[PDB]
Amino acid sequence: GSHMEAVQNRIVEAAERVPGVRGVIHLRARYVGQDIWADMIIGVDPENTVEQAEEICEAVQAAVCGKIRRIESLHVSAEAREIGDTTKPSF
Amino acid sequence: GSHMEAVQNRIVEAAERVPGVRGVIHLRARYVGQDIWADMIIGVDPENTVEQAEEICEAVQAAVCGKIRRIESLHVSAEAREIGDTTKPSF
């Protein structure tokens, strides 16, 4: 419910502190037992190479997991996001 | 079941014909009513820019949707995939 909205809000807040992150585009999260499994897609500069985005996602993984200990699993991949962009969703 | 495996097999086969696609890494698919909604993540060259991967995903969207008319919705985003890579899943 709102506790899932709350943790997702914290996921988003934490991921948006990591350099290279241009907002969270998608996020799904559920409990399996006591733990949380999340799946996220972040926005990054289109002109970044895929390798660069990948490692931005790796940092987002480390920051978000360290910040929120309930998460057992967090998958992070990326999509293109220009600065003044409204062609993709955000939080 | 295997009909969902069958359509996913066709999704994969079709998406792997599109240039820039280095295999399908993830795929989830379900019916909502009579139609199929799929979500996919493909592998692309790490050295490609994100904009380039994005448009590879756009082409994969057009090819897979045109090939399989049951799909009402297909979301495609990308991840890094080197040539001799075994650090990510495949089909």
Q: What is the set of domains in chain B, with CATH numbers?
A: 2-80 (3.30.70.1350)
User: Which residue has 């009579």 as its token pair?
Assistant: B34
Query: Kindly report the CA angle at A62 between A60 and A68, in degrees rounded to 5?
Result: 95
Residues of A in contact with B24 (CB under 8 A): none
Cβ contact A42:A60 at 8 Å: yes
Interchain pair A50, B50: CB under 8 A? yes
CB of A53 less than 8 A from some CB of B = yes
Quote the CA–CA distance of A12 and A61 in Å, as a whole number.
12
Quote the CA–CA distance of A1 and A13 in Å, as a whole number.
18
Q: For this experimental structure, what is the resolution in angstroms?
A: 2.4
Contacts of B79 (CB under 8 A, 6+ apart): A50, A54, A77, A78, B25, B41, B42, B43, B44, B88
- List the structure tokens of A26: 């998608």
Phi, psi of B3 (to 5 degrees): -65, -35
Give the single-character DSSP code of A23.
-
- List the structure tokens of B62: 């057009």
Handedness of CA A47, A50, A51, A55 (dihedral sign): positive
Helix (H) or strand (E) holding B65: helix B50-67
